Design a protein around this ligand. Structure first.
Ligand code: HBB
Lengths: 99, 99
């Protein structure tokens, strides 16, 4: 599809068997999902943005379906105000910026 | 042009007559530039991100050239980790997300 940017680019994703609304974010290196009980092992880590850093749990090889497109990769879970789909997963669904 | 996301989408911009590097960020509502002197009046404002809120200087109707494309709009100046071109200017150059 072609998504314009008049509004935040929010789409439906499926992760851990749940459907969520997430932002397609070309400015995010990683994918950050709002707090949820994903099973599996994880490693702690800190990611930073405008305002400072937050602590998150890093989960590897998690399957995520983005608007019907299947992907699988690292997902960081923590207290983010919004679900963010980063470049690590966008590259997998062949997303590009065009102008 | 068509930009893929295996690397951060960094491009050269011209603002205040100066050249700088900025991230094309579909996840940013606004454009936030690192501290610098920009002619004209400005208003105090606060914006939030992953790690909380920061105080910025709001500059209105500033001409910014993004990879040869012209835009004129609001630019926020403050302590950001990187120069960010947000949706307010991306829509002016006709940027879209495609996949
Ligand atoms: C950009 C750089 C520093 C960091 C990469 N990050 C992606 C950006 O697009 C972030 C993502 C984001 C965060 C919070 C949100 C909405 C979106 O709710 C607030 C809405 C206001 C807004 O639009 N805030 C922008 C601001 C630049 C004007 C912002 O901070 N946007 S990030 O901090 O969230 C990260 C960092 C590391 C790993 C994943 C995500």
């Amino acid at each position: 599809p072609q998504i314009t940017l008049w509004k935040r680019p929010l789409v439906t994703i499926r992760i851990g068997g749940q459907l969520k609304e997430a932002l397609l974010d070309t400015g995010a290196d990683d994918t950050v999902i709002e707090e949820m009980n994903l099973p599996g092992k994880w490693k702690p880590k800190m990611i930073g943005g405008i305002g400072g850093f937050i602590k998150v749990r890093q989960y590897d090889q998690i399957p995520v379906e983005i608007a019907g497109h299947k992907a699988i990769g690292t997902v960081l879970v923590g207290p983010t105000p919004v679900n963010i789909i980063g470049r690590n997963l966008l590259t997998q669904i062949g997303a590009t910026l065009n102008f």
